[PDB]
């Protein structure tokens, strides 16, 4: 008989409320059975009882490490259904904060992966940088993480009068912190022993199982949604896409580090190219007017009242909108029946498919290797369970 073991939910390596039922012969893993749903909150039904603006803060709490990226995907879906266009300055702000968010997510992923493996130190070095980016979030929206800044019309508020300078000051020091992380990990023989040839997935298998993002790029597949299906102003920035060679945990780690560097590159470009103008679509039947207009003009007051009580109506139709979120392809299948409430909202999270493939990726490995594989899949269970 194989030993049957509960891995989580109350486990440090679990990375959330995961009940990994594991069959083991000695420490060899014979079978992985991920039991999820310990963080299923019934988000999609709730979204059905809300208006389109009331449903936005749910996308903050889907993947709690990539908040604005989740907001951007939902906003793109709703804007596509509304047949409107965000203004250019809003799109530049969106891309800038999406890259800052990608930095946040990649720091969290790499350091928690190292912490599982046993290298506890880089976490503390990188979480101070995460703290400074949380400060950027807070200055723009008043919240450290669940900002709700990106709205289906653009962004809620314009940047405060000295934010770009501080973002520049942060961005010109971050590369040295990445360098210190790489000094700790990249050439360590212990880290390579714990990561090289662990959780190897082929290109064909990665495509069929539904993988996306780094889980594809580590296996040599050349696919990045920002390059192939660009959104906002991603076609106007220059960056390279890291590609792996072996499909293992080590290659995925290198891809994420290089991705962090390329995000610094994109941020530098966005800082030097931010244009002037308004921040939300100049269409008061979709985006609320300014407060001075709301307090002086009859139409502005009527539209403020109606947008905050009933909300805008969205013409009937269904869309599937996908973005390159820091964890992979993040999608929304949004169905509108013509009213101000969404009829259906299905959320596609890359972690769902990655966790469904965890059992495949752990064949012939031990317990510690399974811990490394869970770390390398970059799983947050808010997006998996919803």
């Amino acid at each position: 008989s194989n030993l049957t073991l509960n891995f989580g939910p109350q486990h440090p390596a679990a990375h959330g409320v995961l009940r990994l039922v594991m069959e083991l012969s000695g420490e060899m893993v014979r079978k992985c059975d991920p039991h999820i749903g310990l963080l299923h909150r019934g988000t999609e039904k709730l979204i059905e009882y809300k208006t389109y603006l009331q449903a936005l803060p749910y996308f903050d709490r889907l993947d709690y490490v990539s908040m604005m990226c989740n907001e951007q995907a939902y906003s793109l879906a709703v804007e596509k259904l509304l047949n409107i266009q965000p203004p250019p300055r809003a799109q530049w702000i969106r891309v800038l904060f999406g890259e800052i968010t990608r930095l946040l997510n990649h720091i969290m992923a790499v350091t928690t992966h190292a912490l599982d493996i046993g290298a506890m130190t880089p976490f503390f070095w990188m979480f101070e940088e995460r703290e400074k980016m949380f400060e950027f979030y807070e200055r723009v929206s008043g919240a450290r993480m669940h900002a709700a800044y990106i709205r289906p019309g653009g962004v809620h508020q314009d940047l405060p009068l000295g934010l770009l300078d501080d973002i520049y000051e942060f961005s010109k020091n971050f590369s040295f912190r990445i360098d210190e992380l790489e000094e700790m990990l990249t050439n360590n023989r212990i880290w390579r022993n714990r990561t090289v040839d662990i959780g190897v997935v082929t290109a064909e298998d990665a495509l069929n199982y539904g993988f996306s993002g780094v889980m594809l790029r580590g296996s040599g597949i050349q696919w990045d949604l920002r390059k192939t299906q660009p959104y906002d102003v991603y076609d106007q920035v220059e960056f390279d896409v890291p590609i792996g060679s072996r499909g293992d945990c080590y290659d995925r780690y290198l891809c994420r580090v290089e991705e962090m560097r390329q995000s610094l590159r994109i941020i530098s470009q966005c800082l030097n190219k931010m244009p002037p103008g308004e921040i939300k679509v100049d269409d008061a039947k979709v985006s609320p007017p300014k407060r001075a207009e709301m307090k002086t003009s009859m139409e502005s007051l009527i539209h403020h009242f109606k947008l905050y009580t009933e909300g805008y109506q969205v013409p009937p139709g269904a869309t599937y909108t996908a973005i390159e979120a820091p964890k992979g392809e993040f999608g929304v299948y949004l169905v509108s029946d013509g009213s101000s409430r969404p009829y259906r909202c299905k959320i596609k999270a890359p972690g769902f498919a990655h966790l469904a493939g965890l059992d495949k990726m752990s064949k012939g490995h031990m317990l510690a290797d399974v811990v490394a594989i869970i770390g390398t899949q970059d799983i947050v269970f808010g997006e998996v369970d919803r």
Binding site: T202, A203, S219, I243, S245, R246, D337
Partner: protein
């Protein structure tokens, strides 16, 4: 000649021209058993004939890869095997027959 296809689990092919010719001949042979008026047969025959002509006319592997637009001839071989398997399946399925059933009148009506 070439090392490292670059995709994990995709081995480098020695003698890819012969493999491609064999696969395309098998594909045409399987398509020969489908009714001639079926759209699948004529479309697949047309594309297969173009690819086979391209393979026959270009002895150079990199130039052939650039002509085929199929991404690294090992992938072209894999796609040919996929098409052969699909051709056998379509022979068994016969999707050229008339529509099996008509849906209810308001089944695809939206909104509501």
């Amino acid at each position: 000649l070439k090392k490292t296809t670059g995709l994990v689990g995709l081995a480098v092919c020695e003698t890819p021209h012969e493999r491609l010719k064999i696969l395309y001949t098998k594909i045409l042979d399987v398509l020969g058993q489908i009714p001639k008026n079926a759209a699948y047969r004529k479309y697949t025959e047309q594309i297969t004939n173009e690819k086979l002509g391209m393979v026959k006319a270009e002895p150079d592997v990199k130039k052939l890869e650039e002509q085929l637009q199929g991404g690294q001839i090992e992938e072209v071989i894999l796609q040919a095997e996929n098409e052969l398997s699909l051709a056998r399946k379509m022979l068994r399925w016969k999707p050229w027959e008339p529509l099996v059933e008509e849906p209810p009148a308001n089944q695809w009506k939206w909104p509501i």
